[PDB]
Design an enzyme around this catalytic site. Structure first.
Site, PDB file in Angstrom:
ATOM      1  N   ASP A  35       0.782  -1.214   0.000  1.00  0.00           N
ATOM      2  CA  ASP A  35       0.000   0.000   0.000  1.00  0.00           C
ATOM      3  C   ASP A  35       0.823   1.279   0.000  1.00  0.00           C
ATOM      4  O   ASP A  35       1.280   1.709   1.061  1.00  0.00           O
ATOM      5  CB  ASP A  35      -0.957  -0.060   1.196  1.00  0.00           C
ATOM      6  N   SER A 199      -1.444  16.028 -11.468  1.00  0.00           N
ATOM      7  CA  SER A 199      -1.726  15.645 -12.847  1.00  0.00           C
ATOM      8  C   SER A 199      -1.999  16.901 -13.637  1.00  0.00           C
ATOM      9  O   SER A 199      -2.689  17.791 -13.148  1.00  0.00           O
ATOM     10  CB  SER A 199      -2.965  14.748 -12.921  1.00  0.00           C
TER      11      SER A 199
END
Ligand SMILES: c1cnc2c(c1)ccc1cccnc12
Length: 330
Positions: A35, A199
């Site tokens: 994770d 992004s």
């Protein structure tokens, strides 16, 4: 040194990925959920409440000759999905695909919430976010990657998750045969303890790319792609019959639909998530309404580039002096 291990989807939907990890002496192999959105290495164990264990493999510290109880240390974690686990701590030898760390903190569970019990294929988690988020009290502990970093050939790990197929986690090296084109690197903020990046935008199917900054975390421990409501509405508006369902808890769409792809920007580079990656099957057994793989982050508080986005790319988690993230098509 380097390490390389195969990661496998736990089910037909790729709800999560498991990677075999050797703990203790003699080795006790447990399948953990790697994770990058948390920093605790915790396992189901001989100390876990009997009624909270259902099919998982357990770590028995009493059977490991290298296991040492870390005096007075406890841990307690609460995840974004409402799940939780807690217990005591041992230090032990941990290996992942040939790469070994001695004295790694192995957090042994005394209690796990229902959803951990209900998932028989996940024996615990292996946290790969920054060690600043580790929950061990009173003395915080380091992640497996942090402990191995100085020994690695290169201070990096890569995530290469498969869509309905096996994949790979590599430590210490970049497999230049595992991607196409070049790896584009982008800036990471470690302020929240996550692999947090921005992004440059998105596109829906063959539509126009929209330049817009989307701050989010690269999280292998989250199944879906969680994005701003404006972006998620623009996506599902392209699917006939799609709608946001308050009873289901997200965007649902007719199972007969063929989903458009979703592109996200990494600098001037583009990662295309094929439409099939966004189908999470029936909302309930036998239903003809399907659950979407792109959901709104309005309720969470952070955008999450989970497995849906990451599995479309070869991802470099660069632990250099200034950590960065690398993405490539594959
Ligand atoms: C992550 C989160 N929610 C889901 C899935 C994966 C898969 C199927 C599904 C069906 C109904 C509601 N949520 C989910």
């Amino acid at each position: 040194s380097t390490g390389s291990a195969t990661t496998t989807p736990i089910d037909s939907l790729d709800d999560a990925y498991i990677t075999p990890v050797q703990i203790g002496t003699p080795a006790q192999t447990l399948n953990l959920d790697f994770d990058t959105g948390s920093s605790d290495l915790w396992v189901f164990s001989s100390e876990t409440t009997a009624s909270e264990v259902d099919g998982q493999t357990i770590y028995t510290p009493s059977k490991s000759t290298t296991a040492k109880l870390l005096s007075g240390a406890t841990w307690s974690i609460s995840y974004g999905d409402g799940s939780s686990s807690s217990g005591d701590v041992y230090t032990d030898t941990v290996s992942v695909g040939g790469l070994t760390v001695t004295g790694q903190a192995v957090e042994s569970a005394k209690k796990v919430s229902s959803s951990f019990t209900e998932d028989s294929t996940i024996d615990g988690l292996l946290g790969l976010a920054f060690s600043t988020l580790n929950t061990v009290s009173p003395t915080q502990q380091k992640t497996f990657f942090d402990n191995a970093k100085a020994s690695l050939d290169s201070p990096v790990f890569t995530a290469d998750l498969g869509y309905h197929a096996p994949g790979t986690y590599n430590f210490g090296f970049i497999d230049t045969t595992a991607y196409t084109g070049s790896i584009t690197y982008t800036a990471v903020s470690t302020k929240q303890g996550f692999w947090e990046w921005t992004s440059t935008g998105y596109a829906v199917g063959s539509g126009t790319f929209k330049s817009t900054s989307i701050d989010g975390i690269a999280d292998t421990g989250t199944t879906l792609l969680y994005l701003p409501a404006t972006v998620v509405s623009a996506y599902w508006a392209q699917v006939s019959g799609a709608k946001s369902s308050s009873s289901v808890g997200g965007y649902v769409f007719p199972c007969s639909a063929t989903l458009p792809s979703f592109t996200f920007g990494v600098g001037s580079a583009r990662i295309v998530i094929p439409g099939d990656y966004i189908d999470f099957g029936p909302i309930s057994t036998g239903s003809s309404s399907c659950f979407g793989g792109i959901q709104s982050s309005a309720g969470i508080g952070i955008n999450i580039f989970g497995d849906v986005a990451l599995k479309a790319a070869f991802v470099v988690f660069n632990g250099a002096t200034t950590p960065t993230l690398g993405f490539a098509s594959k």
